[PDB]
Amino acid sequence: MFKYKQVIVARADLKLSKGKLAAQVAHGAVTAAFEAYKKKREWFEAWFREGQKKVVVKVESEEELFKLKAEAEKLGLPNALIRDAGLTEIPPGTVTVLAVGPAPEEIVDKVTGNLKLL
Amino acid sequence: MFKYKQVIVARADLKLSKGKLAAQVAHGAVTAAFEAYKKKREWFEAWFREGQKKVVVKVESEEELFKLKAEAEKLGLPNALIRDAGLTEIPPGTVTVLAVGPAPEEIVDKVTGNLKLL
Numbered sequence: 001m002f003k004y005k006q007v008i009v010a011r012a013d014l015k016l017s018k019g020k021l022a023a024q025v026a027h028g029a030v031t032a033a034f035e036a037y038k039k040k041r042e043w044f045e046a047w048f049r050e051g052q053k054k055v056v057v058k059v060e061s062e063e064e065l066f067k068l069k070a071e072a073e074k075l076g077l078p079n080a081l082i083r084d085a086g087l088t089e090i091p092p093g094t095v096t097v098l099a100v101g102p103a104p105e106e107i108v109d110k111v112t113g114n115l116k117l118l
Numbered sequence: 119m120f121k122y123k124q125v126i127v128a129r130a131d132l133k134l135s136k137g138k139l140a141a142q143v144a145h146g147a148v149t150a151a152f153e154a155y156k157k158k159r160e161w162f163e164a165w166f167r168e169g170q171k172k173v174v175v176k177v178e179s180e181e182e183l184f185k186l187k188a189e190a191e192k193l194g195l196p197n198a199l200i201r202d203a204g205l206t207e208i209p210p211g212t213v214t215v216l217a218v219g220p221a222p223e224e225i226v227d228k229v230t231g232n233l234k235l236l
């Protein structure tokens with residue numbers, strides 16, 4: 001089993017194409033990965049050598065993303081709430097995804113454990 | 119404007135679900151972003167500063183990913199060819215995507231320029 005993982009929560013309600021959604025998830029993964037690299041170096045390295053497991057789940061609102069981000073901050077988890085200015089097709093400042101981790105899988109689940117796969 | 123970008127080339131012939139595609143694209147983006155961070159810090163920082171633009175394009179064969187990887191290596195561009203072990207849904211060692219960049223957009227296109235958006 002993978003002891004470490006990064007879960008990216010994506011807003012399915014925005015109905016982004018498979019491609020643009022993938023790009024948004026990537027923004028989240030990269031940003032949160034570097035957050036971990038800087039603030040939780042050991043978690044990052046362990047995750048990386050293990051195969052940097054990632055799981056993509058979904059939610060249907062920005063409200064849900066903000067709530068989950070607050071939970072992640074409370075736990076001290078590396079995370080990244082994404083807003084893409086290059087995404088002019090949606091309102092400015094619109095949040096697209098929330099990446100949680102890398103971190104020990106159990107702690108990431110403490111946040112996203114009740115979310116469904118996308 | 120975006121002077122830098124990262125292009126993630128995904129195999130459309132694998133017919134990956136929306137969620138697994140995003141996960142694979144993320145693996146590529148993260149691995150390639152760290153390659154840039156370590157080997158082309160300046161390109162990484164500019165990219166990150168501009169909003170780390172990412173574009174997901176496609177190819178219809180496994181050979182195309184390797185041909186593109188060779189070109190990216192020849193040009194000294196940060197890149198990452200992904201093979202997801204955890205993705206036991208497909209043959210072991212099957213390549214899913216190739217992330218190219220971050221780097222100046224024109225040089226990234228020198229590799230992926232003729233590929234269609236996914």
Ligand SMILES: [Zn+2]
Pocket residue numbers: 187188191
């Ligand atoms: Zn090579």
Ligand SMILES: [Zn+2]
Pocket residue numbers: 223224227
């Ligand atoms: Zn160009």
